[PDB]
Amino acid sequence: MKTGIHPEYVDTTVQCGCGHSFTTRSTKQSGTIVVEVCSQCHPFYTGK
């Protein structure tokens, strides 16, 4: 893992409009990312 050549990897959590929460890492500097539609929210994943 090269020292400085890489974008800083931020530990973050996913919060969705259905109340579902996910824990991961990402590039988002805020450290917390929101979303309007998720896999649970998305009708296609639910067969709708």
Single out the segment in contact with RNA by CB under 7 A; choices: 2-10, 19-27, 35-43: 2-10
- Report if residue 7 touches RNA, rule: CB under 7 A: no
* Positive or negative: CA dihedral 27, 30, 33, 36: negative
Distance of CA 44 to the CA centre of its chain: 19
Does 4 participate in binding RNA (rule CB under 7 A)? no
**Cβ-based nearer residue to RNA, 6 or 48:** 6
The pair of three-digit structure tokens given for residue 17, joined into one six-digit string: 């409009």
Residues that bind RNA (CB under 7 A): 1-2, 5-6
